[PDB]
Structures are given as C-alpha cells and as structure tokens.
C-alpha cells in the first residue's frame, strides 16, 4: 500500500482537484482535458492528464480509494514500473476510446481503475503466485458499477467508454503478463 507511485498519483489528483476548486472545473479542463481541437493534438500531456481531474469529493475519494487498494497491490507485489506502464497505457487507451464515445469532456482515474480491476483479477486468476487477487466480492460491484454507468445511475453521467476500454486493457495486459514466468 505504501508505494511511491501509488502516493505520487494520489498527491497529483489532490493537487489538481484543489486547483479545480480555486480556478473552477472548466478552467482546469481547458488545459488538462483530452485535445478537443486537432490543433491541440501536440499538447501530449492531455492524453494522460484527463486521468487527474475529478468533479466531486465523491468522484475523487471513490477513485482514490480503489486506486490505493488496487494500485497499492500492484506496486507492492509487482513493482512500481509495472504500475506506471498499466497507468500510462490505460490512461492513453481509455482516454482514446472515451473521446470516441462521447467527446473530449471527461476525466477521472476510473479508466486506470477498471484497468487495475481487470488486471488484478485476471492476474490473480491465471498467475496466483504473483501474490495479488480480486475478491469475487468486488468484481461484482465492478460489474454493477460498469452496467450502472450504462443506465446513467440517478443522473450520474459516467464515462462508459473509459470503463470498458480500461477494463479491456487491464485484461489484455494481465493475460499477456500471465504467459511469461
């Protein structure tokens, strides 16, 4: 749990979130969101910094909770590098698919989070010796969580492309990772 990359991510999300409370959501979005304009396509950070933005205490706490719990496990059991790679691929791919689904106005770490969910479960399943796993007791809630976004649970506009893309990506990485060693 006490991993550097785990905490460095939690720290950035809290910095950025606080920045969002001072400046306002939209003002941070104009700089951190996925490129809305192909002119902006060379502002490379935007492919990753969308993961840093949250729009409610609930949004961020719920994300950081999962991230601490799942990110921690991967960092501890598998190193900081494996975590970073998972975070960068899934922030890049789930941003990418989410932009296609509903455009560039989104953010949150849930893309990376479903990738961690997908990864920890598929990896604990195929490579038990890797010392990580996900309670069936959570992959439920994961499945409810994803399908609840499909129905926009009580007006909650969820990034549906991000969740599935992220989920898929984690499963691919864990499957590939569970063939070596």
């Amino acid at each position: 749990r006490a991993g550097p990359v785990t905490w460095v991510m939690m720290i950035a999300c809290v910095v950025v979130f606080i920045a969002m409370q001072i400046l306002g959501d939209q003002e941070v979005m104009l700089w951190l969101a996925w490129p809305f304009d192909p002119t902006l396509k060379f502002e490379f950070w935007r492919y990753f910094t969308h993961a840093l933005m949250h729009f409610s205490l609930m949004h961020i706490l719920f994300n950081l909770l999962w991230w601490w719990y799942l990110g921690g496990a991967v960092e501890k059991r598998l190193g900081s590098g494996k975590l970073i790679v998972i975070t960068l691929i899934s922030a890049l791919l789930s941003g990418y698919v989410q932009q296609k689904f509903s455009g560039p106005w989104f953010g949150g770490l849930s893309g990376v989070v479903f990738a961690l969910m997908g990864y920890v479960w598929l990896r604990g399943e195929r490579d038990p010796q890797s010392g990580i796993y996900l309670q069936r007791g959570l992959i439920i809630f994961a499945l409810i969580w994803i399908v609840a976004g499909w129905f926009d649970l009580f007006g909650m506009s969820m990034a549906n492309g991000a969740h599935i893309a992220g989920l898929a990506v984690g499963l691919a990485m864990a499957f590939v990772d569970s063939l070596n060693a």
Binding site: D25, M29, H50, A51, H54, F55, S56, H59, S94, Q98, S102, W105, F106, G107, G108, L109, S110, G111, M156, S157, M158, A159, N160, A162, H163, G166
Partner: peptide, 4 residues
C-alpha cells in the same frame, strides 16, 4: 462533463 462525464466522470471516468
């Protein structure tokens, strides 16, 4: 906005 959409919440990932």
């Amino acid at each position: 906005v959409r919440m990932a």
